[PDB]
């Protein structure tokens, strides 16, 4: 019960930030979870041998691709801790609990591959889930972990609390979906412009949690402008393994997956800033004030990639 983790003062201070970027000692990332969790929800929150025990069960069931890891899964629960921090009284406690694990668990035994690949390779899970095919998979995933003796860590929950933190976890990780998101941020704009957004109505909540995902799980381009550069390194060398096995099915993969295509990349990136981040911070910084330093962060990356282009660097 007495029992903190507590980080060395640089990492305790810098964790607070949104830029912050977890290191690359894989054996510190289950320790800095924990921390966030008893900041963030309390020590009382899980029961820390269950929740050390589901981290590990986690952690194994990520695969040894180049981005979709066991390191974006603790990067993007570190965004969301950093939201959660910055709106301190906006959440309640079963959405503090829940968003967390939902975060570490979004990604859950990830390929290296998109839903269009699924379904253009016939693959099993392109059966199974017509839609969202590997977010509905990453959900399957975190309940067979749950389920797994000595890691429910919901356990203390009544059955109602339960039914609803589980709830909260599956539109989170199914809202990781980018094909939703667009909708998603159409919606909230429209409601924060006409000024019928109401964080008391469940369906507004559920499309605000469906933006911070969206947020966190982009989060590479609101860090310094190193950690963006070579977090796009590990996307691509994903993307273009993809566009790869596309030309394997006769099948030419979108610009963006094809490696013969890397000159355009400074192009394409100032395509998705425009087109997906910069709106995404936009719309989240309207709706929750505090978290503008992210939209600080991603315009200054635009600015950069500008730069890439103008042959500054
Ligand atoms: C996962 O989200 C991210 C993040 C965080 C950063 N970068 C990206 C890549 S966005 C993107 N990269 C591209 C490269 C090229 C084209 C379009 C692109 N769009 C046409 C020519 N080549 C994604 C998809
Ligand atoms: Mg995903
Ligand atoms: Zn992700």
């Not at 949690?209 to 947020?215: P, R």
Request: with cysteine; charged share 20%; net charge negative.
């Amino acid at each position: 019960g007495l029992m903190q983790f507590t980080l060395p003062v640089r990492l305790c201070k810098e964790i607070e930030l949104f830029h912050f970027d977890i290191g690359p000692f894989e054996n510190m990332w289950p320790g800095i979870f924990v921390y966030m969790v008893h900041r963030s929800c309390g020590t009382s929150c899980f029961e820390l041998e269950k929740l050390c025990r589901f981290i590990m069960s986690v952690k194994k069931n990520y695969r040894r691709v180049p981005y979709h890891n066991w390191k974006h899964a603790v990067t993007v629960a570190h965004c969301m801790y950093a939201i959660l921090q910055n709106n301190h009284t906006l959440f309640t406690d079963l959405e503090r609990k829940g968003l967390l694990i939902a975060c570490l668990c979004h990604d859950l035994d990830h390929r290296g591959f998109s839903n269009s690949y699924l379904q253009k390779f016939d693959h099993p899970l392109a059966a199974l889930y017509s839609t969202s095919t590997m977010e509905q998979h990453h959900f399957s995933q975190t309940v067979s972990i749950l389920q797994l003796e000595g890691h429910n860590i919901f356990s203390t929950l009544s059955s109602s609390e339960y039914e609803q933190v589980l709830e909260i976890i599956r539109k989170a990780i199914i809202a990781t979906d980018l094909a939703l998101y667009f909708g998603n941020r159409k919606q909230l704009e429209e409601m924060y412009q006409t000024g019928s957004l109401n964080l008391n109505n469940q369906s507004h909540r559920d499309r605000v949690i469906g933006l911070m995902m969206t947020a966190c799980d982009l989060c590479s381009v609101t860090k310094l402008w190193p950690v963006t550069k070579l977090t796009a390194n590990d996307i691509y060398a994903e993307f273009w393994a993809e566009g790869d096995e596309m030309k394997k099915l006769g099948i030419q993969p979108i610009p963006m997956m094809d490696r013969d295509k890397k000159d355009e990349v400074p192009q394409g990136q100032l395509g998705f800033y425009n087109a997906v981040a910069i709106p995404c911070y936009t719309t989240l910084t309207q709706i929750l004030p505090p978290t503008e330093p992210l939209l600080k962060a991603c315009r200054d990356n635009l600015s950069q990639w500008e730069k890439v282009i103008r042959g500054e660097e």
